């Protein structure tokens, strides 16, 4: 369930847009605009349980909160590290916020403008593109089509059960 939430300086989600088709049906009829990203993701995960896209209690479910620093922010590269650091803390807050839901274990991945441009074209979230990218380095036996339907939890084991060795 890949969704991209564009946030303002005040941490409020300006627009909720789908990265993948699964996220599109999930966000159908969701008013989550002008609200803080922390509550936005919390309601979003819970609605993924309601629609039944993902299993709440059955599997060790990894929920991915990935965030990238925007292209316009990256106009200059002066202390872009600082913005990334604050972004990492922003994501760390989202992580601690949404982990309060039943059997939700969260991974947070900070990404650059590259992962986001590619992720929206490949039809995934930034972090699911990022671990796919790394999984093609660690193996290369993972296709982009399967990534649309698979779990990010299953992607972690794709990366760890790496078979670029024969």
């Amino acid at each position: 369930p890949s969704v991209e939430l564009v946030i303002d300086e005040t941490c409020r989600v300006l627009e909720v847009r789908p990265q993948n088709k699964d996220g599109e049906q999930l966000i159908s009829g969701l008013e989550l605009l002008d609200k803080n990203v922390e509550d936005v993701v919390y309601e979003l995960i819970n609605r993924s349980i309601s629609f039944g896209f993902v299993k709440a209690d059955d599997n060790r479910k990894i929920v991915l909160i990935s965030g990238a620093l925007n292209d316009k922010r990256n106009e200059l590269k002066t202390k872009k590290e600082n913005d990334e650091a604050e972004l990492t803390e922003l994501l760390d807050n989202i992580k601690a916020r949404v982990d309060r839901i039943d059997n939700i274990k969260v991974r947070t991945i900070t990404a650059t403008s590259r992962e986001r441009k590619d992720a929206l074209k490949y039809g995934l979230s930034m972090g699911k593109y990022c671990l796919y990218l790394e999984a093609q380095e660690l193996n290369g036996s993972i296709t982009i089509d399967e990534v649309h339907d698979m779990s990010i939890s299953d992607m972690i084991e794709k990366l760890e059960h790496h078979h670029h060795h024969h």
Binding site: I7, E9, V63, S125
Partner: peptide, 10 residues
């Protein structure tokens, strides 16, 4: 303009 958060719920 701060950033974009791509979530993937499993």
């Amino acid at each position: 303009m701060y950033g974009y958060i791509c979530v993937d719920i499993n």
